[PDB]
Structure formats: C-alpha cells, structure tokens
C-alpha cells in the first residue's frame, strides 16, 4: 500500500464479506440467486422478489446479523431487461460494524411486497419509488405521491421519460389562475455524445456476441 | 461538400404571379387554390407533369394518381431511357443487375459511353479495386477518359 | 414575408406568429386579454402606456422574454404614435374613458387620437387596423360617448378604409364595469331605474368571445375593411337582466322607479369627483339605451367564435359580491333571466 | 399651482414606502441562507427599515428566494393575490430568475416571471447577501421614481 | 491605486459606467449570427 | 410464461367490478368538489368529464393494466376529496386556455409539418 | 470514545436545596441571561454602513462573467468550447466561423446569467484564460432579458473591469 | 471599425445587423444597441511583425502561463508572415 494514488485494498474484510454471504445463501436457497463481492469490498445478495420479506427479516433478526438499519431503498430503471425495474436494499448492521445490499426485480405490473413490516422506514423509501418509477408495492400503509405534483401523471426517474417532461406550467390572466400547457422551450437541452470510440477497462469486456 | 448549396437559392414561401407578371409572395390557400382550379378545368393530355433528379418515390407515386384521377399518364422524366421492345416493363432491362459489389467477382468489365470517374465516383473505385486486387480487365467504347 | 415574421412553432408561449401588433389602451379592461391572447401563442407586443409602469406590471407575465415591449406615448403626440407603429403589422385601438377628465374629452379620446393613430399607421404602411366603436353609437343619441364614437367610426374609415371596426355591446366579466357597475348599488339601497327598466332592451357580450373575435379578425384576411357587430346570444330586459345579477349575488334586490330628470340629476352629483366617478350623465343614459339589431352587418359567428352565455360566466364576476353566506352556492340555484324571443 | 402640490406629495408617499419595505417571511431553498444573512448584524436589513413580517396582509415584497417547482407555483401566487397593493416582488437566485440549473426538469418553474410579475431581479447562485442588499436599495431607486400623482394631476 | 497603480492597456475603458438598468442605456439582448438560409429573389422581369 | 402474479383482480370479471365502483365514488364525490373548490363549471360537467377519462381507457382488456388504473384514479380521489388537490390541479382536466388544434390534413399542412 | 450530555444527579444537602430553591424563586438563572444581552447592548455593533462600506472578498471570487483581450486588443477566444462543455447549467452558447483573416473567432458567445450558477468552471477550462468571473456582484437588473448576455456585452464588461480582473489573476494564477 | 448601416444601426464586429424590414430593431427603440467599439481584427492588425533569425520561433502570447499554450512557428515560406493561431502575432525570418 505505498503506491501513492492507488486506493488500499482490505482482503480481510473481502475473506470476511464472502463467507457470510455463503452463510446466507446456504441458510436462504429458496429465494438467494446470486452472492457477489465487489473489489472494495461491499456485499450483494441477488434474491428473487418473493424472499423480499424472508430474507430482510432474517438479516434484521438473526444473531449472526443484525442489520436493524434500513439506510437507503431505491430502484433502478434497466429498459433493456425483461424485468426493467432493479430494487435495492442497502442495509445497516451497528452491531457488526457490516453493511450489506439486497437486490431483487419486478416489471411494470408486478409487483412488490411491502418491508414495512421489517422496517418502519420503508414507508416514504416505497412511495417515492411508486411516485418516480411506478412500481407498486402491495400492503401498503398510504401509497400516494409523495414528491411529484398533485394530478402529476408519469414516472418521472423511468429512462424513458423525458428531462424537460409533458407539460409546464405558468398563470393566466384570462382564468385567474396557474395552468398547465405542453412543454415548449426557447432554448432545447443539447444533448452532447461524450462517450469515446475507445475501450477504457479491458476487464469488463464484455464477450463477444 | 455540397450540403453547403442547401442554404442557398432556397424556395421559402409559396409564389404566385400578379397583374403586372411578376412572382409575389402568398399562403398555401390561394397557391394551391390557384393551381387546383386549372387541374379541375383541364383534363387528359392538356395535364403532363416531369420529374426531376432530387424526387422521392414517395411524391412520384403521389402526382401520378393526381394526375391518373384527371385521365392523364403524361407523367414523364428528364433522362431517357428507351421504351422500344420491352422498355421499363422488366426491371431487369434498366438496372445494375450484377450490383456493385458483382463487381469485385468479375473477370471482364466492358464500359459503353460513360465515364464512370464522374457519374458514378463510389462505382470506379470499385472497379479499381478489382482492377487492382483480382486483376481484372477493363474495356471501354468511348472517348478516351482517366 | 420577411423570415423573422413566418409562423414557427405550435402555438405556444415560446412559438412565433408573425403578428407584430401595437395595442393602444392595452392597460385596460379588453386590453389584457387581448394582450394575453396575443402572448400566448407567441406574438410581439409593443404595449404603448400613458400610465404609471406599475400599473402595467400584470401584462409583464403574459409573453416570452422580449415579446411585450413597453413605451410611453401621448394622445397629442403624432411622433410618439409613429415610434409605435413603424414595425408593427396590425395596430389594435382600444382607448377611452367613460368619463371626461379635466384634459381629455370624449372628442379627443374617440375622435382626434384615434384619427391621429388611423393616419400615422397609414403613413408607416400597417397592413391591419382594428378599431373598437360602439353597437349603439349614433349621431343623434343622447349620450356624447356614443356620438363622439359614431364620428370617430367615419373618421377612421375615411382616414384607414381597409380597417376592420368592430361595434360590440356591453361587455361583461370581472373587471367589467357592467355587471359589477349593478352590483355596487346595493350601497345605495335600491335599484334606481328608469321606467322601472321595462323598455331598455340589452344584449351583452363575454369579453372572451371579444378577444377571440378580434384576434381572428387578425388572422383573416377577409375581415379586412369590414365592419362587425359583437353581439351576445340572447337579449335580456334591463329590469330582468338586473334582477339575475342580485340573484347571483345573492342580495336584496328593491327596485324603485326613478324619472328621467332625477337620474339625471343624481349623476351630475357623482360627475363631481376629481376621481373615477362612480357614475355619471352619460353612463346614465347608456345604461338605458336599448341595444340596437343591426342584421346587415356580420357578427361573432362570421369569425369563426361561439357567442358565451351569460348564465355561464355570471357567476365568476359576481361570486365577489356575494356574502360569506352565499359564497359556495353553486351555478344552479338561480333559475336563469326571462329573454326576449327572436 | 397644482403640478408643485402633486409632485412633493408623490415624493413623501414614494419616501414612506421605499423607507418601510416589509418583505415577506417567505424562502425556498438556498437563496433564503444569504437573505437571512442580510438580516443578520453585519449587513441589518433592518437599519434601512427593511423589517420581515410574515403575513402576506402585512407585507409589502415577496422576495423569491429559491427554486420554484411546479408544485410551490400556486401557492406562491396565492401569497402575491393576497398582498395588499403597492406591492413589489424581488427574484433572487438563478432559479428564480430563469430556473438556474434546474431549467431543464419536469419539476421546476422555468422563472417566477411566469408565475408573478418581477421588479427586480438579482443575479446569483447564491446572490450575497451585498447582492441583494443593492438589489433592494434598487428597488427602494425604482420606488423613489414613481409618478402616480403627476400622472393623475395629468389624467 | 494611489500606490500600486493597474496596468494600462488602450482598451480599457477611461470613463466608468454605472448600473444603467431601467434607463436608456441599458443593455438589450440581441443575436450576433448572420442569417443562416438566403432565400431566393425572383426575376423581375415579366416572363412570357 | 404467461403466469404472472396478479395486482388484485384475478380476471376482467373481477376487476371491471372495480372500475365500476370506482365510477360511484367518483359520480357521488363531484357534487361536493365543485362547491367546496367554488368552481365555475356545472355538476353535469364534471361528471361527463369522469366519464370521458373512463372512456379513453375503454379498450384495455388486461386485469393487470385495470388494477393500476383504479389504483391511480383511487389515489386521485383522496387527493381531490381531502383538499390536496387546489383549483389549479382540478381545472387540469378541462384544458380550458389550450385553444383548439387542427385535427385535418389541410390544417395541419397549412401551419406546419407535423403529422 | 463518548461523554455523557445530561447524566448528573443533583445533590441533595440542605444548602444545594435551599440554593435551588432561591434559583426557583428568585428566578437567578433568568436573571443571569439578561445580564449577557446587556453586556451585548455595550459592545460595538458588527453592521458595517453598505453601501459605503463593503464586505470583505478574495481575489478568487466568482461574480460577473467577462471576456477578455491580448494586451494588443486581440481577442483570448478561439472558440475551442471547451467551457460550452464543461458548464453544468448549459448557459452558454457558441458560435464560430473564420474570420476575415482565417482566425478562428466567435460569431456567438452568449451566456444566460439565469442559468449560470456561478461556479467557475469554465474559467478552470479555458486553455487562453479568455472567460473569467469577475469581482463584480453589483449588476442586478430591472428585467430578465438583461441578464442574457451576449458577446458584446461581456466584451464591454471586460474592457470595463479588466484593470481589477488581471490584477486578481496575477495574485491566483500561481493557485491555479 | 463600426459603421453605420442606411438605418443608422451601428454594425457589429460580426457583422450583424437588422435589415430595412425586421420588426426586431424595436427592441432598441427608446433603449440601445450595444456594441463594442474595438474591433479585435483592426487591432491586431496594428501590431508590427517581428524580425526574428531562426527558422522556428516560440510564441506563448506573454506572461508565460497568463498567456496562451506554447507554439512554434515555421518561417521557411518568404510570401507570408508566420502568424499565431492564439494570439494573432506575426513573425518574419530576419535575411541572415
Ligand atoms: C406622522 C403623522 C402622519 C403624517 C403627517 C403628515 C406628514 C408629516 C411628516 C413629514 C415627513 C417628512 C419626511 C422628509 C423626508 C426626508 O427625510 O428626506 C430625506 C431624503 C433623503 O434622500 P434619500 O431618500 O434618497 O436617502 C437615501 C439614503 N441615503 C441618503 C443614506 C443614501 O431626501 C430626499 O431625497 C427627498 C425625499 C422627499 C422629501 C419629502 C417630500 C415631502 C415633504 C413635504 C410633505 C408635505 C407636503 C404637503
Ligand atoms: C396616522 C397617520 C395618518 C397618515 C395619513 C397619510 C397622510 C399623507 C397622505 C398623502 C396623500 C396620499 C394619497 C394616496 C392616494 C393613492 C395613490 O398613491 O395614488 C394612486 C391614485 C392614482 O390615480 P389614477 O386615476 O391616476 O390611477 C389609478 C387607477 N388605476 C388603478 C386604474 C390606474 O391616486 C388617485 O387615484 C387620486 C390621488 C389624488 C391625490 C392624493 C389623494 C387626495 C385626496 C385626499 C383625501
Ligand atoms: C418576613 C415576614 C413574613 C412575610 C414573608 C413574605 C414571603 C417572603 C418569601 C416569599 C418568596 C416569594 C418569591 C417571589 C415569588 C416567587 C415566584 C414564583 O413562584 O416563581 C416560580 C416560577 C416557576 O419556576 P419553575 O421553573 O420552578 O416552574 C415549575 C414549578 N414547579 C417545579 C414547582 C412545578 O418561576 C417564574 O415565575 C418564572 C417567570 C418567567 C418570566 C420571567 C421574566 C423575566 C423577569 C425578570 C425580572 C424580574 C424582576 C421584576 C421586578 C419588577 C419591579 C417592579
Ligand atoms: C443601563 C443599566 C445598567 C445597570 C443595570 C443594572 C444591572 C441589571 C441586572 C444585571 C444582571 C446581572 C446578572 C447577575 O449578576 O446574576 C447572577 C446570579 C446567577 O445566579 P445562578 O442562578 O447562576 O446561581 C447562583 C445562585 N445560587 C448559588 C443560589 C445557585 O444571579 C443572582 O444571584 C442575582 C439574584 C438577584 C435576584 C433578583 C430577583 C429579585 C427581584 C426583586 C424585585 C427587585
Ligand atoms: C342615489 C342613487 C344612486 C344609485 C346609483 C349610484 C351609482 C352607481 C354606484 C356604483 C358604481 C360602481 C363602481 O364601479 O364604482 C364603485 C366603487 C367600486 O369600484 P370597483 O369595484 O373597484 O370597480 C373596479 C372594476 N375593475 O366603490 C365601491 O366599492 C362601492 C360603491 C361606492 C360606495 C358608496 C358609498
Ligand atoms: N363594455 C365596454 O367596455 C365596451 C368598450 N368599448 C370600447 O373598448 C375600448 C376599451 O374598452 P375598456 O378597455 O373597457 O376601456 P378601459 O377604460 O377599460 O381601458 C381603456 C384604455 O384606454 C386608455 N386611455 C383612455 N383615455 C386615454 C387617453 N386620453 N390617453 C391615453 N390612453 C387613454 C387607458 O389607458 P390609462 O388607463 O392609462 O388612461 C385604458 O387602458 C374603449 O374604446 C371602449 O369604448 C366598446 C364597447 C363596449
Ligand atoms: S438560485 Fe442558487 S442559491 Fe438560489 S436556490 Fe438556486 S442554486 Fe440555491
Ligand atoms: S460559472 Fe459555471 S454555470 Fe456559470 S457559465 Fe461558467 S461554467 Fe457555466
Ligand atoms: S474555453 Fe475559452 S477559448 Fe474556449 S470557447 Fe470558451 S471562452 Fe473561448
Ligand atoms: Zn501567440
């Protein structure tokens, strides 16, 4: 660790981060998918959507884990795949000093069970996802928009929504009041091409088709 | 390094002659009135029509049922192609039936009245390429040309 | 046409219409939505005002940045007229007062400016010049507003003859002046009316259907020296059309008649303020006047617009003058006026 | 004469309001930083008599400090609609004055000129709190150029 | 200044300007492009 | 493949159930949205204004797709009964400042190039 | 490590109680907290008398945009768009062509101020030190449209403010 | 240098300006044009060539890195001065 611009690497907590994750997948075989480890070293679980409950309340709860913190549930959009929608759990073990990821899928009309039951904050985390992404997540306390507009109609984070949106707003006279018209702008948002026609990372090439 | 002619001479707004004879700006409404009076007036022959280099297939087919729904087949081009014996009939008789890329499987190649350099820069180089890679045999009737 | 004035666009607040218009009296009450119509689908503006720059501020959000440009003019000055009309291509007039203030008359503010902006637009080469006049404007009627407006009407013809002149009626809506002028009298009491309001025939016009009508008048080439007649649906006895507005409003309505010299009287007393006068002579006898029926000349639906109800857009005007009792009370709980049949 | 009258007396109701502008406690993100550090000692909005009030009833400026969204935007002109006239309004910060560096999203009102008129507008990312202070006493300038009683004299 | 004088350069300004907003001199935004697409003028002469 | 784990409707059956629930609270619920907002439109209005958004959806035939329907209209209901909603957001449905657009070839052709 | 904030049990001896007692009804501690605004009351106060007298700025601070010149009059510009680029706002525009004599030069340079956010980016990119924000924070305006500058303007704010400009520069550039 | 157009609008450095028949010159009516008034191609022009006595000469502009990137410059060709491409500076080959 004496190169001076190149991030240490911990083996330990590699060694570590990658027997528990053989520790879940061995006590958890009906939901786990896939157990991988990243080079600095944080732990995902790739489980099929129906262990969403089952494996969150084992982490919570069991002795060998801990993870009583939900720090952050969010959604990732991935039009190419069939299950476009990527929801990932990051977790929080005090006791342990451990951090860990839960993955799992759903598209647009599956959808989700609610970790409200697990974890009181999942509450808003749930909603803003229904609110940016349209993913539904059944047994919900209020599932309602929580940061678009009221009446607003779209999901906003898709890939596949538009920057600048459908509709803007501005008053009218004549009414008396705020109203909404479709989008026009004096100057157009510039899309600039920045990627470069030259691999970078060969240990990502992907294989040849 | 032609595109640059596209922002020039250009055609903007619909014109239609004055009393005086000279062309005036107006709208779509009284250009195409205009000219739609004539099309319902005439009918037949006395309606023709010519097609230039820069047409899309697209506003071609859309002119000859304009002018079929008036009993005209006066629809005619700018480049002559025989129409003795079988003329446009077959395809065949007015194509590059080999396609370009026939070219570079080709053993002889006889050129009759053209200078392919310059109607048709991207189809010598690739004779040339077979010219230069398959060895290939080159005759033309015509006038001597680079 | 020149490349900058080609439509582009959809219609919107950031488009192009090709219209470069210069709206005289654009601070009032038709002036802000004629402006807000021609904001909104991307027009330029050039708003001249004699008044103070606040009292323009409420047309400032209605177009694009740089489409609303504002200058000061003067009625009496030919040169400031010119300033205003040189680039544009339709000149829109909507200037007047109900009133005669100390400097300006009714002859100044519907004879001479108007004459002088009818001759300057001509000398700069406007194409369109829309003039407002008066349904009832008549060389022979009792009120000076209006026969001040039928000369100005001859005046802008012989002066302009392409332009289009368009004679509405009364005109309603929440800066009206007309239904809120009714409203106002429950102060007094009563309802003074003359001959109890039974021979005074009335036919007002929503003033969105005014603005759309004078924008289309813009974009037609027919309009173009002709003159129209804005007219509402149905016409309306003034003693029922009265009663409606108290019934909106919800308010005791006690009509008493009142002769013709009284009321007369009454505004003389009410001419006497340095202010805007609550009423006056004039606005007296206009009031009172029976609008005319003028078949020969086209109306709103020879422009393409729908003639808007009264019974629809009364109560937007008139929820205002309601108590907090009556506020919510919907649009169906006052069964509609009597109308005089066709 | 008249004109005399009409003149000193547009100067005393120019002087009393540009010498008691309430603005409104209002702000929206972090524009509002930098106005309460115009309020605060080194600068003291209040030694120019500039005092937050924060009932619309009682204000006299709406200074938009921050982002408007789409959402805000009715209320913000409900708070305008219900101050008393004169009123002014102050945009501060790029995001109200043109949407900044949020112009481009679904969510966000491209300038509050669309929503309210503006007398003032103040450039920034923030704007310092000098920044607006000269925005103000610009806009105390404006005031003090008023001609209402001239133009009525004149009428 | 008075001490450590700025540097001299002929473009510089000699007479400062303050705010000029809200009067006759304020600045009014305007594109510096030349037209892009020339349209074609028509003969003038009468044909035929 | 084409198992698929339902929303609550288990079949078109079941959920039109839904939707036609849906239309009941919405019928009953625009008396009272256009007194408590003070709008300027007719109860008859607004009511064939809830049956023209039921309309435009008239063609679905997926149990899946009707689910969310009725749960975003659902949501739309608790935000226009408790008030959450403002004028603003209610006199969206009327789009009453776009004026009218061309819906004919020759006017559309006269005012741009759009389809 | 980790202290305890509010974990200490008072004493219970007659003169701790008595003396909390007093503190109840005596209101000695209330007492105490007006003697600290009265000691504020006789210490200077920190407003300084804007607008003749300013706050304090370094050399680095990033206000009104300016373009700058060659000491010959020359233009720094190239066109290079580099700062077009790199602005994470999207405020400016450029355009460019050929000059009369083959130099590369803008036709358009215009930066919406409403956009902007000030940060300084595009004077870390440009290579010829040709885009600077300047010192001056004084330029709010009565309406928006001027606040979207064009190249003529940011010229003149240039020429305008290029005395204190390079002056700042030379103080930074050994920073930079 | 700016010159004034038939209008009397002033022309700018790009040469820009409205023509007789654009309504958008009414965005100057009772306000301005502004225009800078040092034309860069006029100044730059002013500046003498400089007599050098090597084939290849190095130009950063001045101020080292308060100026431009370093450049370097063939003075071989007689039928022109070698210019800048930053800065605008001609240099000539001093005959040896
Ligand atoms: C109180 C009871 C109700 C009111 C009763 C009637 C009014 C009595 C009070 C009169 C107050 C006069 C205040 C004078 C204003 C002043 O101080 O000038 C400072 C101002 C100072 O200039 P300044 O406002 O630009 O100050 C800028 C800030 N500094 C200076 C720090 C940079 O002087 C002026 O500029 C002229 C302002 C107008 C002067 C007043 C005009 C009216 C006088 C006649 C009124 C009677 C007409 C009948
Ligand atoms: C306790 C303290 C008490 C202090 C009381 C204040 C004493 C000092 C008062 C000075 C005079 C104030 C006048 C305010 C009038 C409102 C105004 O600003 O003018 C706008 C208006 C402008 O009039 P306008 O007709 O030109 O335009 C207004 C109409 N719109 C909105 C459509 C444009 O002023 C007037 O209407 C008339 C003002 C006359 C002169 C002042 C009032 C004289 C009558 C005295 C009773
Ligand atoms: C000697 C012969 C026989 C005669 C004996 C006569 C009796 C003499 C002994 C009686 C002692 C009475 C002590 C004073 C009254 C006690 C008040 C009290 O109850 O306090 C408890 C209260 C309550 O304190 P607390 O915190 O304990 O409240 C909770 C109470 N327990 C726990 C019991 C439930 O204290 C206060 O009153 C706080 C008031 C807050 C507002 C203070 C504002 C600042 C004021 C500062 C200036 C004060 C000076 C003003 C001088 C005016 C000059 C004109
Ligand atoms: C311009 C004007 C300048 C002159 C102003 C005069 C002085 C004004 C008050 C200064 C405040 C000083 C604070 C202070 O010393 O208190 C410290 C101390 C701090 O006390 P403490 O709460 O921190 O604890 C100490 C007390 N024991 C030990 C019991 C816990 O407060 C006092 O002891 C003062 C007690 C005075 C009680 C006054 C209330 C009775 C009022 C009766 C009516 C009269
Ligand atoms: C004797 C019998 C006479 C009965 C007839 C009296 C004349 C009619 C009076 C009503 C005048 C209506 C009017 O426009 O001015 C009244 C004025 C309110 O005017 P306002 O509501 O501000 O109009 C603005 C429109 N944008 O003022 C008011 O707000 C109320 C009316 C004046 C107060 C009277 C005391
Ligand atoms: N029911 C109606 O309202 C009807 C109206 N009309 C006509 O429509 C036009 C406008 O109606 P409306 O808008 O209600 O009138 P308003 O009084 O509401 O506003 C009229 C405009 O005229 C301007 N104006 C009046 N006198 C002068 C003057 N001497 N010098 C300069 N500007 C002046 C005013 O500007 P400022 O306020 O700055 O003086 C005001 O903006 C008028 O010509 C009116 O006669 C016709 C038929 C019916
Ligand atoms: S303008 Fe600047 S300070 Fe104000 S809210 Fe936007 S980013 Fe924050
Ligand atoms: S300071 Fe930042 S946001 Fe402003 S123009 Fe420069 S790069 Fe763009
Ligand atoms: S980075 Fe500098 S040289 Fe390049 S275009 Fe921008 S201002 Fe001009
Ligand atoms: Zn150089």
Request: charged residues 25%; proline residues 6%; glycine residues 6%.
């Amino acid at each position: 660790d004496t190169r001076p611009t190149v991030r240490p690497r911990n083996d330990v907590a590699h060694k570590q981060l990658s027997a528990f994750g053989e520790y879940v997948a061995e006590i958890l075989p009906k939901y786990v998918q896939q157990v991988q480890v990243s080079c600095f070293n944080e732990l995902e679980i790739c489980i099929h959507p129906d262990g969403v409950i089952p494996v969150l309340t084992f982490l919570r709860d069991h002795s060998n884990a801990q993870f009583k913190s939900l720090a952050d549930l969010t959604a990732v959009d991935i039009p190419t795949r069939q299950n476009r929608f990527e929801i990932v759990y990051n977790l929080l073990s005090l006791r342990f000093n451990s951090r860990i990821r839960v993955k799992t899928y759903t598209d647009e009309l599956t959808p989700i069970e609610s970790s409200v039951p697990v974890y009181k904050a999942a509450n808003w985390y749930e909603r803003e996802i229904w609110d940016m992404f349209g993913v539904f997540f059944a047994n919900h306390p209020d599932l309602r928009r929580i940061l678009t507009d009221y009446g607003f109609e779209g999901h906003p984070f898709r890939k596949d929504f538009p920057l600048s949106g459908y509709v803007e707003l501005r008053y009218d006279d004549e009414v008396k009041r705020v109203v909404a018209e479709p989008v026009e702008l004096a100057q157009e948002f510039r899309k600039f091409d920045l990627n470069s026609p030259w691999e970078a990372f060969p240990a990502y090439r992907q294989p040849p088709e | 390094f032609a595109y640059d002619g596209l922002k020039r001479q250009r055609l903007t707004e619909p014109m239609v002659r004055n009393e005086k004879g000279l062309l005036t700006h107006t709208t779509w409404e009284d250009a195409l009135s205009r000219v739609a009076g004539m099309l319902q007036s005439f009918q037949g022959n006395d309606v023709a029509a010519i097609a230039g280099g820069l047409v899309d297939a697209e506003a071609l087919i859309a002119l000859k049922d304009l002018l079929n729904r008036v009993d005209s087949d006066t629809l005619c081009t700018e480049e002559v192609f025989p129409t003795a014996g079988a003329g446009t009939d077959l395809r065949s008789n007015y194509l590059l039936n080999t396609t370009i890329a026939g070219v570079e499987e080709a053993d002889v190649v006889l050129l009759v009245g053209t200078n392919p350099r310059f109607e048709a820069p991207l189809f010598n180089a690739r004779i040339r390429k077979s010219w230069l890679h398959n060895d290939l045999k080159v005759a033309l009737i015509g006038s001597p040309v680079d | 046409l020149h490349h900058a004035v080609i439509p582009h666009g959809k219609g919107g607040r950031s488009s192009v219409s090709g219209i470069v218009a210069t709206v005289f009296g654009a601070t009032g009450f038709l002036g802000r939505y004629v402006v807000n119509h021609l904001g909104r689908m991307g027009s330029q503006v050039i708003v001249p005002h004699r008044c103070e720059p606040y009292d323009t501020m409420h047309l400032r959000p209605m177009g694009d940045l740089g489409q609303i440009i504002f200058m000061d003019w003067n009625g009496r000055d030919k040169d400031s007229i010119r300033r205003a009309v040189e680039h544009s291509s339709v000149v829109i007039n909507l200037v007047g007062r109900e009133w005669e203030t100390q400097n300006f008359d009714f002859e100044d503010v519907f004879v001479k400016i108007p004459q002088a902006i009818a001759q300057v637009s001509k000398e700069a080469g406007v194409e369109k010049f829309i003039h407002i006049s008066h349904l009832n404007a008549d060389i022979k009627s009792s009120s000076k507003y209006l026969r001040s407006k039928a000369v100005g009407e001859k005046e802008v013809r012989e002066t302009f003859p392409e332009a289009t002149i368009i004679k509405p009626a009364e005109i309603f809506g929440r800066e009206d002046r007309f239904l809120n002028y009714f409203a106002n009298i429950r102060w007094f009491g009563g309802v003074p009316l003359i001959s109890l309001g039974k021979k005074t025939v009335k036919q007002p016009v929503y003033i969105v259907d005014v603005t759309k009508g004078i924008i289309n008048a813009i974009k037609d080439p027919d309009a173009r020296g002709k003159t129209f007649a804005f007219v509402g649906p149905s016409r309306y006895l003034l003693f029922d059309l009265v009663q409606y507005v108290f019934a909106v409003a919800h308010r005791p309505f006690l009509p008493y008649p009142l002769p013709h010299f009284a009321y007369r009287w009454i505004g003389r007393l009410f001419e006497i303020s340095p202010f805007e006068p609550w009423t006056t002579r004039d606005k007296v006898e206009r009031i009172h006047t029976t609008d005319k029926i003028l078949p020969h000349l086209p109306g709103l639906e020879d422009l393409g617009v729908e003639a808007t109800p009264l019974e629809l857009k009364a109560i937007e005007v008139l929820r205002r003058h309601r108590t907090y009792r009556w506020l919510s009370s919907e649009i169906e709980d006052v069964q509609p006026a009597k109308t005089i049949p066709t | 004469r008249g004109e005399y009258v009409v003149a000193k007396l547009d100067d005393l109701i120019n002087w009393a309001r540009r010498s008691s502008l309430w603005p409104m406690t209002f702000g929206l993100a972090c524009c509002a930083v930098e106005m309460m550090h115009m309020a605060a000692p080194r600068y003291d909005m209040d030694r120019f008599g500039v005092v937050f009030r924060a009932s619309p009833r009682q204000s006299d400026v709406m200074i938009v400090a921050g982002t408007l969204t789409n959402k805000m935007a009715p209320a913000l002109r409900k708070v305008y609609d219900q101050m008393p006239e004169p009123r002014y309004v102050v945009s501060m910060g790029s995001c109200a004055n043109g949407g900044g560096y949020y112009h481009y999203s679904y969510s966000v009102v491209r300038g509050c000129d669309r929503i309210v008129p503006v007398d003032i507008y103040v450039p920034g990312c923030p704007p310092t709190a000098e920044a607006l202070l000269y925005g103000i006493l610009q806009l105390q300038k404006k005031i003090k150029r008023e001609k209402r009683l001239r133009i009525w004299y004149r009428r | 200044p008075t001490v450590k004088p700025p540097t001299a350069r002929k473009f510089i300004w000699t007479n400062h300007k303050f705010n000029l907003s809200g009067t006759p001199q304020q600045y009014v935004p305007y594109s510096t492009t030349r037209k892009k697409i020339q349209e074609w003028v028509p003969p003038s002469t009468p044909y035929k | 493949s084409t198992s698929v784990k339902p929303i609550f409707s288990r079949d078109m059956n079941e959920a039109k159930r839904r939707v036609r629930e849906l239309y009941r609270a919405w019928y009953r619920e625009v008396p009272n949205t256009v007194h408590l907002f003070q709008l300027d439109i007719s109860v008859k209005q607004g009511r064939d204004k809830v049956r023209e958004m039921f309309k435009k959806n008239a063609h679905i035939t997926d149990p899946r797709v009707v689910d969310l329907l009725v749960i975003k209209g659902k949501m739309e209901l608790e935000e226009t009964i408790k008030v959450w909603k403002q004028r603003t957001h209610v006199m969206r449905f009327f789009h009453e400042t776009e004026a009218p657009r061309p819906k004919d070839f020759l006017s559309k052709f006269y005012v741009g190039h759009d389809p | 490590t980790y202290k305890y904030v509010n974990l200490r049990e008072p004493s219970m001896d007659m003169k701790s109680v008595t003396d909390r007692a007093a503190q109840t009804l005596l209101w000695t501690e209330l007492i105490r907290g007006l003697g600290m605004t009265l000691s504020y009351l006789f210490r200077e106060p920190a407003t300084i008398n804007y607008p003749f007298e300013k706050g304090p700025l370094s050399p680095r601070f990033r206000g009104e945009h300016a373009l700058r010149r060659y000491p010959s009059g020359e233009e720094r510009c190239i066109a290079c768009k580099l700062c077009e680029a790199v602005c994470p706002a999207q405020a400016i525009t450029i355009e460019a062509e050929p000059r009369a004599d083959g130099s590369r030069r803008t036709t358009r340079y215009d930066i919406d101020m409403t956009k902007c956010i000030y940060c300084g980016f595009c004077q870390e990119a440009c290579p010829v030190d040709a885009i600077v924000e300047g010192p001056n924070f004084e330029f709010s305006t009565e309406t928006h449209e001027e606040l979207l500058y064009n190249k003529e303007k940011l010229l003149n704010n240039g020429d305008k403010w290029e005395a204190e400009i390079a002056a700042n520069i030379q103080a930074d550039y050994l920073y930079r | 240098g700016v010159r004034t157009s038939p209008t009397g609008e002033k022309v700018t450095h790009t040469g820009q300006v409205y023509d007789d028949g654009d309504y958008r010159k009414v965005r100057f009516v009772g306000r301005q044009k502004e225009v800078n008034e040092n034309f860069a191609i006029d100044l730059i022009a002013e500046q003498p060539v400089s007599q050098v006595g090597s084939r290849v000469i190095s130009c950063d502009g001045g101020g080292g890195a308060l100026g431009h990137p370093r450049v370097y410059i063939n003075l071989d060709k007689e039928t022109k001065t070698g210019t800048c491409g930053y800065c605008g500076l001609q240099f000539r080959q001093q005959h040896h």
